[PDB]
Symmetry: D2
Subunit: 295 residues, 4 copies
């Protein structure tokens, strides 16, 4: 059981410091109507760090409910650097109708490979829905090694692949060569096409928040082996794909969504904050080059 294809790491819109739940539902519906295959509530892009556990839960529920009666899957953000917390989130997602969970490598405490293994095993054994690993060492301070990922995929029935955001093409090659059953998911927008053309089966995208049609089309073109068309969109997207990381994600994507009139308010929770006026200008300029779907 797997979750693949074009997916969106949903931004979490705030209004006066709280999640704007109507806005959230509306943004999710906008994803659905633009051909997206799955949404990821409360990943990194959704400011998982600054949402309380109960708000985190509410967002997951809104995604499930908004996606009900549609083919769009909900891959709920359920990671934590504490296994008991990650287990709690995983169980909740399962109990509340999520289709799978995305579970980021523990940040800050730098577990050993053995610890990572037990972390994810405890999580995968706690629910019967697909678990996607999520490697992003630049943020977590640790890496799930290729051996650990493969071992987890083989030992745990529900662990089905990994979202890679380690900027390491070679590891991606290794993963699929040793374990071609696993689903490699691009966590790096700029190289969506190369990852897909090289055996990856989906993306969890930041850019698709703004340009869901473009990211969905890219992903589907590639899965269909229409590489020319997929490369073409990837090339077109390169500028925005890079600019959306001029400051730590999701600062730029939220800024663009606001500039586009897709969210009412440009609000973060500290320590995240508005970009510098210079990057605000930079984001505004790149944005003009693209056609941005409305509601």
């Amino acid at each position: 059981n797997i979750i693949i294809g074009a997916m969106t790491a949903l931004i979490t819109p705030f209004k006066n410091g709280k999640v704007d739940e109507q806005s959230y539902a509306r943004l999710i519906k906008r994803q659905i109507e633009n051909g997206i295959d799955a949404v990821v509530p409360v990943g990194t892009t959704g400011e998982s760090a600054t949402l309380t556990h109960e708000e985190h839960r509410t967002c997951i529920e809104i995604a499930v409910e908004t996606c009900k009666g549609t083919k769009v899957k909900v891959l709920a953000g359920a990671g934590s650097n504490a296994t008991h917390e990650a287990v709690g989130l995983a169980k909740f997602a399962k109990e509340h109708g999520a289709d799978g969970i995305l579970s980021v490598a523990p940040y800050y405490n730098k577990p050993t490979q053995q610890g990572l293994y037990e972390h994810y095993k405890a999580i995968a054994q706690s629910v019967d829905i697909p678990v996607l690993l999520y490697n992003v060492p630049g943020r977590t301070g640790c890496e799930i090694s290729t051996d650990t990922i493969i071992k987890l995929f083989r030992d745990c029935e529900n662990i089905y692949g990994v979202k890679e955001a380690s900027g390491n093409i070679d590891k991606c090659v290794d993963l699929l060569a040793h374990e071609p059953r696993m689903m490699l998911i691009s966590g790096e927008d700029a190289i969506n096409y190369p990852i897909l053309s090289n055996g990856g089966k989906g993306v969890i995208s930041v850019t698709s928040n703004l340009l869901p049609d473009m990211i969905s089309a890219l992903t589907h073109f590639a899965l269909d082996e229409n590489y020319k068309e997929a490369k073409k969109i990837n090339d077109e997207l390169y500028n925005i794909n890079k600019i959306l990381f001029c400051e730590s994600n999701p600062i730029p994507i939220k800024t663009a969504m606001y500039l586009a009139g897709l969210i009412e308010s440009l609000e973060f929770r500290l320590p995240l904050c508005s970009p510098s006026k210079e990057n605000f200008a930079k984001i505004e300029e790149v944005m003009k080059k693209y056609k941005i779907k409305g509601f």
Copy 2:
């Protein structure tokens, strides 16, 4: 007001998955009686990541109370990657008698330097006790730049320095060359001496959990500029210091405390776990060279 000198990042003993509160109190007593100037409850070494906010709060209470009627100060771990969580921990520490707080840079969500400034300013403005910044980019995925550290030190009266755990002596020179009024504290036992010998004013040690008398002496000898004697102790500590990081802290230190009979069970919270058998054996071997004080 400041909190400097020899300081111990207290490990957090678990018994059957719960904080062993009597053991915790006993360990702190032991530190007090071995010349330590301050104890740091629930820092990284205390597994801040896997304690609930309640357990976290309980550990701060145990420390404050245990140190009552002594010279020994409590520098409460109060960091978080969410500013609202960090403010609550700071306020709690203040309201419950902690002498100051240690506040680690936001991990995982990678805030901008502007975000780090606002994060720490909000924390500093919420309490009137001393605030020590804490820089450990290997763990957080971000660095508080020297400029940001200095601006915060200057702009906020209660922010009085930084614990550096970045293994970057160039930066330590940079901080004190440009702003020698701040209290630079070593957050890595391996370079306590380099930092102390460059005008650092203390340590927040891991090694001092096992050898509080050695770390204390080392620190006071250096503070007295008796570098002959300081380096003498530091050279003696080389082996233990090195082995206490063969796996991510606090895996080795807890393993050592257990071998030394100072804690009842070798228990961690996932994703942390016991060291490899090989490292367990190495740690045990290294400890033989040292005189480990009991209670």
Copy 3:
């Protein structure tokens, strides 16, 4: 621009008793020619450019040029140096001795600024009228030719026609061709031949092709023909050898493989290069068993 693209081999330089084995070298090149290779690269990194003297370097270029004469196979001569006066000297030699083009690695060790890189390659490009392919390998040189610098050189210098990327940076490969799709992007790492080719790259300068020229050539031409199913088939078959051929710094594993296959007489390097560990030696030997290795 005139170009040199397609399937290319970064020729090993065989030594016997510490000296260049010129007969073996020529024989190895003829084998490449007979296996569908589009061009050969004498005295690149894989050919131990660093430890050949200037006169040996030049002999190897001459042997490659003369051996390829009367065939379709082009010679893209190694002519890089971290000293511009040496690089220009090698470039002029290559040009005057009939090489079809040159490959010129970014200056290593002295870490020039981007302006310096631009001046370095501009001087090289002005000194000859043959194609120049830039060569970026920051892991080795301690410097990177920025995407901006590459594109500027490509556009400003008539004969600079592309770059061999050996950086394991697919993002950079997208950057290059997204902004300047006229340039020839050439893979300089076998492990990412396919990623680069499938992104519009126009060739490879291969280590693996020393041992398996027929496979690398077919892989490249399938991909160039947009026959991605067949190209992928081959690339997948190649995984094991590609991986093991970098268990130690290239060309330590490739020469070991060439020796084990009886294609070179002695397993000899010039220091500081040396034999792989016995364990890696054994691993290489095992991995080769799975492959059909063409003889002479």
Copy 4:
């Protein structure tokens, strides 16, 4: 047999593209008259890369000749990424009266530890003068492991230590902890003091080209255990120490020597070239803070 103390990695002046041999001798005399213990002709700082073998040998001879009768030693730059070239240079230097050689780790071709061991062994066995290893992975793309350095020091009588330029204080601790008989030499001006206060026995300096009296003083104050003074100079020197690397060495140091009127023209050999105007401005600005000795 060892070469330690305050040493200078000499710049090589050009005039109309040729080595300015008179200027070179003059600069060497200036070092000698300012308390320097040894000079290093044709290291990285002396643009080893772009000198011919014949020019490289000429510079070595000039250094030996100018130092003759003085007690100042010549630690000749004899490094190469080709063992036969490094041997050639080593032999030339021994035969022409150099006191020892500095031999950088092979750059570009990334030899294995075994290869590095054999490289250095061949060099050490080619001559009977002291050989100092030189680790600068940022420039070479390889590292001489701690283990390899210790083996070489132990196995070869004339290999007496290493100049470290890897900004890794921890390795410096490891090296002296396992092998306290070796001479650790600072190849990183900004942290000369920390290295010396932690067991180092000398510096091979870029800054000393410009401020030989201050580098000499700092080194000797430290070797005589006057850490207060040594640190003082180190702190003062921080700005020039840092600005001297705003662009790749020796671009900034040559710019500064020219600004000080110590060389006739700001000339490099490509691919090195003049710094940017902005950086020129920065260097000129920082220099005003210092009293620069003339001839």
